[PDB]
Design a protein around this ligand. Structure first.
Ligand SMILES: Nc1ncnc2c1ncn2[C@@H]1O[C@H](COP(=O)(O)OP(=O)(O)O)[C@@H](O)[C@H]1O
Ligand SMILES: Nc1ncnc2c1ncn2[C@@H]1O[C@H](COP(=O)(O)OP(=O)(O)O)[C@@H](O)[C@H]1O
Ligand SMILES: [Mg+2]
Lengths: 49, 621
């Protein structure tokens, strides 16, 4: 129940971004990192599973 | 054995084909000059491109890849013929010459995990790392004996691996005459060839995660004895054959497969003169500016990295005294100031670069270790990261997390450039001349402006004196600077490689102008290409400048001025103490700048640039 914004963030996490190498040899990350801080019993582990 | 062969169509035709292959008279071929170079250098083997052979004669290439031994024999015969033709005198020294192979093998490019019995008796290419090596041992080929009783000398010829299968009649050492008179071996007249054995493992970076590695065994002949060492990444091209077991009655039916190497590879003027002579100061100006377009600003750090790339001059005297010539830098800054990007770029550009983070490697894995060999009971030395990086670069990310003992160990490398090792039974002094990059976070997470840098750095004065340069980087949130940073970042993000369709998944001295990577305003200037930059860096590193009398007194007076200004600097604090190492640092930076612009002597401008760098780095508001 709830967390439509959280679910959309998880969906765009699953799809992920695009990685880009550069002519200098340097690279830039193409993946997304998320953090969830909350009280116990807020249905966080279930989303991870 | 009196058996001889009179005719063989295939062998004769193959020899004729190789004779026509290596002519290079009516063609643009180069092999003639290669043979002349071999004669000049007293070497006795050749390397021939497989793709070139396939282009000239596809059938011969197909046969050689599918069948190795006979075709290689034909190659060696043709080499003997042409070496005799060009210069018959030189061909007398050596029995037979050898052939190397090179080029893109295609399907036969095979990993140690994917070597199978399907490739037996063919020529294969393999990429791996070296794990085990053995001592070099001589092997007898031709033996000579003398009989004091009858004053007669005899000679015996040996050929073991020349023929596929050997018999007990051969490989017998003579000791007695026909009338039982003793024979005396005469080691001077005999012939020996060297022999070595190595082991190659699939690189851990290439192996599937969580699976055990697989390895191959290689035999190195007389020429390739010293071409490999343990802990090295190599590519080996050679035959893949079975090993004949010794005589017996009952056999289980399982052979041993051994790769016999033929090629071992360590995987890796007018323009320069004109550019240098015309530009002088603009040389280092553009090199500092064009160091890395992917990184925005920070001219001082780019200058310092360029000084590392060029470096100082190693000097020695009569008494055996050694004077250091390497430079060392430490960067401290707020998060997201692209320190790790700089480290990665230096790793990519520098020839010998090794990354070793804070807790990734300990004190033992940094310098070296001593291990007792169980096979012989002797003591052996295993080199660490810093010994491998002789005359190279070691990059240390998260330098603050490193333990104290590791830094005390690094002291020996940073001061003198040597490592002393000793355990009862062995002691040695290994060379470890090297340069270090280090990036460390501030203790408080983010750099505090009000507190003096000593509290933020949290490092002792000795370690600070060990480093040549200290730099502090900050993320100032100026709206216009943020606008510039956003412009640069999004320009780099929107860029796509030319020749790649949009939406798809995944040499001139000056680089061609780009609309996005450079911008419309930058049309008045250009950036230097990476390849020419590397060539110029190598040439500059070769050059040996000399210090002039004009600048020595100037630098000494400025050092005295700084040590007196120690009392004058009241409005600002000092990042690093001023010791005797500062003067050597001044001379070193002056020589590095003199290396930047190809010349013969160190001038005043280099000293001024060095002093500007020192003044900027050593004090902060
Ligand atoms: N909004 C909700 N809808 C459905 N089930 C829920 C909801 N909130 C909590 N739960 C139930 O409560 C439990 C929450 O435990 P858990 O997600 O492990 O908590 P946490 O992730 O904080 O450790 C889940 O098993 C889930 O079935
Ligand atoms: N001056 C700069 N020019 C371009 N990009 C930058 C700059 N400073 C920071 N960045 C961006 O911010 C990120 C910083 O990551 P990182 O280099 O790991 O920071 P740090 O090394 O300080 O932890 C990089 O991905 C880089 O793209
Ligand atoms: Mg970092």
């Amino acid at each position: 129940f709830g967390g439509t914004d959280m679910k959309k963030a998880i969906a765009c996490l699953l799809f992920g971004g695009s990685r880009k190498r550069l002519p200098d040899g340097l690279t830039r990350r193409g993946d997304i990192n998320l953090l969830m801080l909350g009280d116990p019993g807020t249905a966080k582990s279930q989303l991870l599973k | 054995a009196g058996t001889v062969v009179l005719d063989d169509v295939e062998l004769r035709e193959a020899q004729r084909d190789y004779l026509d292959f290596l002519d290079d008279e009516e063609d643009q071929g180069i092999y003639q000059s290669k043979v002349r170079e071999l004669i000049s250098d007293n070497q006795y083997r050749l390397i021939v491109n497989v793709n070139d052979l396939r282009r000239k004669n596809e059938k011969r290439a197909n046969r050689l890849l599918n069948n190795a031994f006979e075709e290689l024999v034909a190659f060696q015969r043709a080499l003997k013929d042409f070496v005799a033709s060009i210069d018959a005198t030189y061909a007398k020294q050596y029995e037979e010459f050898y052939v190397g192979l090179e080029g893109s093998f295609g399907s036969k490019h095979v990993s140690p995990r994917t070597l199978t019995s399907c490739f037996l008796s063919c020529v294969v290419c393999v990429e791996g790392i070296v794990t085990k090596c053995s001592l070099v041992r001589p092997k007898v080929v031709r033996s000579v004996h003398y009989c004091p009783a009858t004053k007669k000398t005899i000679e015996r010829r040996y050929s073991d691996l020349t023929t596929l299968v050997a018999f007990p009649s051969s490989s017998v050492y003579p000791t007695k005459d026909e009338e039982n008179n003793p024979l005396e071996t005469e080691y001077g007249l005999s012939v020996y060839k060297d022999h070595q054995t190595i082991t190659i493992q699939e690189m851990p970076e290439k192996a599937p995660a969580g699976q055990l590695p697989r390895s191959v065994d290689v035999i190195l002949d007389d020429d390739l004895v010293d071409k490999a060492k343990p802990g090295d990444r190599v590519q080996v091209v050679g035959t893949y054959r079975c090993l004949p077991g010794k005589k017996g009655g009952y056999t289980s039916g399982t052979f041993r497969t051994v790769l016999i190497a033929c090629n071992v590879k360590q995987m890796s003027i007018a323009k320069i003169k004109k550019f240098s002579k015309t530009r002088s100061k603009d040389i280092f100006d553009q090199l500092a500016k064009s160091l890395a377009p992917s990184i925005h600003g920070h001219d001082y750090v780019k200058k310092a990295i360029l000084c590392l790339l060029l470096g100082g001059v190693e000097r020695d005297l009569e008494n055996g005294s050694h004077i250091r010539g390497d430079i060392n830098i430490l960067l401290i800054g707020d998060p997201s100031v692209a320190k790790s990007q700089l480290l990665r770029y230096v790793l990519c550009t520098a020839p010998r670069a090794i990354p070793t983070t804070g807790r990734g490697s300990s004190g033992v894995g940094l310098t070296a270790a001593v291990t007792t060999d169980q096979e012989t009971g002797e003591r052996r030395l295993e080199a660490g990261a810093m010994v491998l990086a002789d005359r190279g670069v070691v990059c240390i990310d998260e330098f603050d997390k490193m333990s104290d003992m590791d830094r005390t160990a690094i002291h020996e490398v940073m001061e003198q450039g040597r490592v002393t090792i000793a355990k009862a039974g062995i002691h040695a002094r290994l060379n470890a001349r090297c340069s270090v990059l280090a990036a460390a976070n501030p203790v408080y997470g983010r750099y505090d402006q009000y507190k003096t840098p000593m509290e933020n750095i949290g490092l002792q004065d000795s370690l600070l004196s060990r480093f040549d340069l200290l730099f502090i980087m900050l993320d100032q949130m100026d709206p216009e600077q943020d606008r510039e940073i956003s412009d640069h970042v999004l320009r780099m993000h929107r860029y796509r490689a030319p020749g790649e369709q949009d939406g798809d998944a995944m040499t001139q001295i000056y680089e061609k102008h780009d609309n996005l990577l450079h911008g419309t305003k930058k049309k008045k200037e250009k950036m230097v290409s990476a390849a020419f930059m590397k060539k110029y860096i190598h040439v500059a590193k070769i050059i040996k400048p000399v210090l002039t009398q004009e600048s020595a007194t100037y630098i000494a007076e400025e050092y005295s001025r700084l040590r007196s200004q120690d009392s004058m600097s009241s409005d600002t604090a000092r990042t690093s103490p001023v010791t005797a190492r500062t003067l050597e640092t001044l001379i070193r930076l002056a020589t590095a700048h003199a290396k930047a612009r190809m010349s013969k002597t160190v001038d005043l401008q280099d000293a001024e640039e060095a002093v500007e760098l020192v003044q900027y780095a050593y004090f902060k508001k």
